[PDB]
């Protein structure tokens, strides 16, 4: 029973091995894109505020 269980465990293990390695790059790219998006949103809202102060003044 334990032998079969170990087979199964090592299987899921190498599965996660390929996976987690793929997901590391995937999540790094995801967080990097989110950071770029927050940066762009900050620049865009700052530009909007600048144009708003231009309009108001």
């Amino acid at each position: 029973a334990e032998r079969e269980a170990m087979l199964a465990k090592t299987a899921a293990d190498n599965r996660k091995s390929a996976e987690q390695v793929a997901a590391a790059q995937a999540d790094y790219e995801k967080e990097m894109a989110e950071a770029r998006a927050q940066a762009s949103a900050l620049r865009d809202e700052a530009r909007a505020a600048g144009r708003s102060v231009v309009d108001e003044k």
């Binding site: 996660k16 987690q20 940066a39 900050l42 700052a46 530009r47 600048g50 144009r51 003044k57």
Partner: protein, 49 residues
Amino acid sequence: LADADAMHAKALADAKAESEKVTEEAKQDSERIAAQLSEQAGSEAERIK
């Protein structure tokens, strides 16, 4: 699964740190954009006056 785990943790931590760096650079750029637009607003108000 230990290393992949180590690599994923390192990727998350490095992504968070470099995202903080990206956001700091973007905040500085936002500040400079706001300063430029405020200076332009002042110049336009001066010309209108």
